[PDB]
Design a protein around this ligand. Sequence first.
Ligand SMILES: *C/C=C(C)/C=C/C=C(C)/C=C/C1=C(C)CCCC1(C)C
Ligand SMILES: CCCCCCCC/C=C\CCCCCCCC(=O)O
Ligand SMILES: [Cl-]
Ligand SMILES: [Cl-]
Length: 264
Amino acid sequence: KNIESLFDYSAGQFEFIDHLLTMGVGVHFAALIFFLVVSQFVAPKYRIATALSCIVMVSAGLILNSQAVMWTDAYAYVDGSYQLQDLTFSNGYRYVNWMATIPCLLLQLLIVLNLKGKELFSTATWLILAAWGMIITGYVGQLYEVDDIAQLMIWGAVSTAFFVVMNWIVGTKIFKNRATMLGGTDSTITKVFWLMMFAWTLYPIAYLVPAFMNNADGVVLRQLLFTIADISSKVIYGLMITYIAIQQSAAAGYVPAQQALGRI
Ligand SMILES: *C/C=C(C)/C=C/C=C(C)/C=C/C1=C(C)CCCC1(C)C
Ligand SMILES: CCCCCCCC/C=C\CCCCCCCC(=O)O
Ligand SMILES: [Cl-]
Ligand SMILES: [Cl-]
């Protein structure tokens, strides 16, 4: 049901996608160790924001690892090209993983925005419901990326509605709570918003690839887009969230944070 299954791949195409996914694994697990060691410099009220980046690194890292092994399982070099065998490859498992990872990305944002208690719980609940609506309708949509492009488009429009409303909640909370933020991170959090708008928008672009480039090179392009998007939305994002967490920790008087920033 996925366009990947439609084509044979050149050694070049096949190896590049393998390398993309493998590099993706390496980057996320390398970052995991960074987030782990810096977590001790985060104040208690923000420390979970950095823990969530650890959780996202392993979750994303595992899905990329799974995709890479699925990729090599599904194809074998036969008569001069990589051809589909008995096992299958699908991006559908990425969608399932987003059900977990996207709530984590959203929660660590709410934490460094200094949201608490009732507002935190209510905002998280609405954000996660919006995200799940987006992910589920998008998942259904890509089931038709071969059989019914029109259906892919309509489910994609519905998904985009959830996406836009989710982003509006995000932007509203960010620009409203920006003033509460310490250590100059009121400025930093603005860049985080735009990083999110940019990186997360790469995913619906990848989703539309079967509509504007239905060939083996389109398959490569989609994995390339996912790689840019994953690294930007999880790793670079997590680094900014953790920076913001440490800076606010220091400004709030957390001594290990102050000491850590002092060494650099
Ligand atoms: C780390 C993974 C992330 C941040 C994934 C984000 C995914 C999206 C923003 C997905 C968006 C979609 C649309 C807005 C329309 C097409 C269907 C989706 C689900 C790909
Ligand atoms: C934050 C950005 C992260 C970027 C991650 C991607 C790094 C590698 C990117 C690709 C370089 C272009 C490779 C050339 C493609 C050759 C075409 C092919 O062989 O199929
Ligand atoms: Cl604290
Ligand atoms: Cl993920």
